[PDB]
């Protein structure tokens with residue numbers, strides 16, 4: 348329980364601001380003014396907060412939690428910018444891999460389960476047809492994805508191992524995650540219980556804390572892009588829409604169900620759209636369906652900016668209160684986008700049971716560990732029509748991907 | 752429920768993105 352949040356204060360508060368916030372809060376919950384249930388405990392909690400924050404010795408080591416996060420991120424930025432300025436190129440060759448099964452299809456190409464012929468290790472190969480990517484006008488999107496993936500490092504991101512290109516295709520070889528997409532397990536289970544949803548949500552929250560500190564917007568949160576690893580922890584895949592953005596950006600991209608209002612509207616937007624999408628993800632995960640569905644995307648768009656959300660009656664009230672603050676059409680009022688940023692979400696009642704450090708360390712017991720039947724089993728993935736892999740004799744689109 | 756109206760629809764499958 349954050350003491351600064353208890354006294355309603357800025358981490359930087361003066362000692363007089365602490366002594367005045369303490370008198371202001373204790374009045375509101377003093378039993379002389381408040382017999383209602385829980386005022387006894389909130390009065391006790393306001394007492395503890397003033398006792399810690401006004402002793403400079405207790406305040407210094409309580410402040411170490413935020414100082415630790417600050418240092419971790421400062422170092423994570425230094426390591427990212429190193430790889431950002433010198434990205435890895437041409438770190439393998441197609442003939443080094445045995446092609447096994449298609450793991451999914453797209454307008455760009457496909458994803459193939461493959462095996463390294465020397466180490467026998469298994470990998471997910473994203474194959475991208477150069478001509479298509481030109482045809483789909485997704486050239487920058489494909490250079491971004493490779494560039495960002497090779498530079499990030501965080502427990503809940505997929506890991507890019509090698510990348511390279513031939514005369515016809517782009518290749519991105521990432522570590523294989525056998526549990527498959529969250530989408531599959533969610534459609535089949537129906538919905539997760541709130542503690543089950545909170546488990547995944549907390550991982551997404553920490554991952555966005557990391558990405559936003561690098562100035563990265565993710566822009567494609569949805570259950571399809573969340574892989575489940577053997578210990579039941581999330582791996583975020585698909586960075587085709589991710590962009591390094593210091594200020595505003597303007598593109599209409601992503602999945603209709605998950606789009607913040609200001610992406611749909613012509614005005615510009617910032618990384619707050621990722622927190623709106625987190626709201627949509629928690630909703631879908633706990634309800635079994637998204638908060639905004641309809642058959643035409645413009646109908647989805649109308650419901651999105653409409654400002655109205657219906658919650659299932661099994662939604663706990665803390666959960667609805669978190670959701671009301673994330674699915675907030677007014678971005679000057681949306682959680683994650685305020686003075687205290689991500690800590691407004693981490694300090695929220697719905698997360699009170701969350702051990703953020705244990706989650707990051709992956710020490711929390713997972714509520715679901717997918718059916719492990721071998722280091723190269725594909726049961727947790729759907730079945731797609733195979734197709735053979737063609738490579739021209741003449742190099743296609745040399746200039747447009749010379750960077751890759 | 753809305754969950755019944757959901758499986759009564761077709762947006763139950765994997766959602767494709769829009770790149771515009």
Ligand SMILES: Cn1cncc1C1=CN(c2ncnc3[nH]c(=O)[nH]c23)CCS1
Nearest residue numbers: 450451452453471521522523524584585
């Ligand atoms: C990385 N990985 C490790 N184990 C399994 C995987 C796979 C990831 N998927 C995708 N990843 C990245 N971009 C994509 N565009 C798509 O249309 N599907 C994409 C498909 C499911 S399997």
